[PDB]
Design a protein around this motif. Sequence first.
Motif, short mmCIF file in Angstrom:
data_model
loop_
_atom_site.label_atom_id
_atom_site.label_comp_id
_atom_site.label_asym_id
_atom_site.label_seq_id
_atom_site.Cartn_x
_atom_site.Cartn_y
_atom_site.Cartn_z
N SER A 1 52.48 84.97 40.87
CA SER A 1 51.54 85.85 41.79
C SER A 1 51.95 85.72 43.37
CB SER A 1 50.32 85.41 41.39
OG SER A 1 49.41 86.16 42.01
N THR A 2 52.87 84.79 43.72
CA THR A 2 53.29 84.59 44.93
C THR A 2 54.77 84.61 45.21
OG1 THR A 2 53.06 82.07 44.60
CG2 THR A 2 51.28 83.25 45.68
N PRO A 3 55.27 85.10 46.50
CA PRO A 3 56.59 85.54 46.68
C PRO A 3 57.63 84.57 47.17
CG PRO A 3 55.43 86.10 48.57
CD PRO A 3 54.27 85.54 47.69
N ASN B 1 59.14 87.46 44.34
CA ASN B 1 58.33 86.78 43.22
C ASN B 1 59.06 85.63 42.76
OD1 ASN B 1 55.58 87.43 41.91
ND2 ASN B 1 56.31 89.54 42.79
#
Lengths: 48, 466
Positions: free
Chosen positions: B226-228, B233
């Motif tokens: 959910s974080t790049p 991603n």
Amino acid sequence: ETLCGGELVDTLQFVCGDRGFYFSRGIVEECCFRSCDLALLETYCATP
Amino acid sequence: CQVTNPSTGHLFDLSSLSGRAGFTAAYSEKGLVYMSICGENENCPPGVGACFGQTRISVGKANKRLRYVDQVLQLVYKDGSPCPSKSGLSYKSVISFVCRPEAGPTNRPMLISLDKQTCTLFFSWHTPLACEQATECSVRNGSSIVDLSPLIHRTGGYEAYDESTNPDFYINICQPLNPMHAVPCPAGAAVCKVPIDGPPIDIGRVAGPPILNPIANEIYLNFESSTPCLADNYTSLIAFHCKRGVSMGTPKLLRTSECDFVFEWETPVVCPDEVRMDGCTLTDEQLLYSFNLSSLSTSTFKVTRDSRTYSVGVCTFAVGPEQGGCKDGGVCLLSGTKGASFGRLQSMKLDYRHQDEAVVLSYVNGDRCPPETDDGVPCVFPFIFNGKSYEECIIESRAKLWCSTTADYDRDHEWGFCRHSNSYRTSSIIFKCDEDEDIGRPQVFSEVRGCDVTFEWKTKVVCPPK
Ligand SMILES: *[C@@H]1O[C@H](CO)[C@@H](O[C@@H]2O[C@H](CO)[C@@H](O[C@@H]3O[C@H](CO)[C@@H](O)[C@H](O)[C@@H]3O)[C@H](O)[C@H]2NC(C)=O)[C@H](O)[C@H]1NC(C)=O
Ligand SMILES: *[C@@H]1O[C@H](CO)[C@@H](O)[C@H](O)[C@H]1NC(C)=O
Ligand SMILES: *[C@@H]1O[C@H](CO)[C@@H](O)[C@H](O)[C@H]1NC(C)=O
């Protein structure tokens, strides 16, 4: 924005907890006589 | 007090916790966070959902603001009493609801960790109330179905190896990661990365059920994010091997691809059920002849010592289809209510002891071995607390997971913090010779920590050199 009385004591164990805390200027002078951050509060937590 | 997943349209109802009396979250040793959900708490001042001990120091006002954030249902308590730090800053609390299909006592609001600077309290609550899908954990290898359900860490997670105690990663391979202490791995995460400088980052969230490789028969399991990444991603993949043995294995790191993560897990659960060579017999070339243990494979046995009623079946399931508490278990420690396996009947091995001229039968990979306190004193199940009986390490009025060391806490107040073992239960039977014992009876020889039980069975079968 001062942090005095039992409202300082309840906050101590919230940060220190099972590690424990001290009161040694002193912490009452740093956070109650003035204003401190929670980092200048966890410096008074007893060493784990 | 109601949130829906935009993709599926799944209705979430958390109104079964809307009690104004509320619940008590645990911090420190005797710390009390009187808190409520969707409504204001009664111990706290009006409007305040959660507060502190002797003084009513608010950590956020109560609202209905409910969010769906990657399998999780977040509740945000904002605008509390001003916090030290700097001017204008007040206390706030983020109470998350993570999916947990397995119901039990650890279904309570816990305090996972706190950020000092932003005056934000991280909360985690694991209930089946916050579950959309089922527990997809099994895949099909032909006609026989392979499951990964025993490998689910239900107390915390798997600590990863220091590639190049100070940890690096935390892993949970079907359900989201269980809330540990002082380590703020974002609620709902499956794979967690903890750097030396910087907060934990979400490098893993459970995607789908395990996939199967056609060729060399490997099983893979995907965990997205959910974080790049630092090139776009995030992603994390776990590969499985077949390693038969006493250990159930632990997810180790092998390749750190710049935006990917490869974890190689060697485990006997990703192995097929191997049918025994010569039925239920022993053959070593030192003696050259065979011992026919199929005569003992007739029925169930009840060996009992110190209230502990075991069930032993040589070449047969411990408890039959009737009670069936310990599935696959060749030895089953009965309680009438629960039951715990001491080795999957399929993992049976036969060897010859040359020292005592005996035949060794052993099953392996049963249930998880019993937890102990940090000092070294084993926990005692079941124990009473306020008027309830408990089966595993719990979290009432305490921070980390705790057990009792007596039959009753209310009566003796004896306890310690749990440290769980990453080994599974084993059981062995050493067959000893006796001529007049046509069909003999096994007896308990040694119980070690409840993590291993050895039985001594005296029979006529394991004798004839006449
Ligand atoms: C090792 O021991 C076992 C058990 O003694 C041997 O298998 C058994 O062989 C006997 C043959 O007499 C079977 O008995 C028969 O049972 C049927 C009923 O199903 C009955 O109608 C016959 O009159 C006869 O008594 C016995 O059932 C069978 N074991 C079981 C319990 O299934 C085995 O052959 C021996 N190992 C070797 C050397 O192959
Ligand atoms: C799948 O089944 C085959 C049966 O021939 C077996 O050889 C293979 O090891 C199994 N694969 C796994 C590890 O699931
Ligand atoms: C990762 O990508 C998906 C869409 O493919 C998106 O929904 C998700 O928010 C992304 N994660 C980040 C960087 O927030």
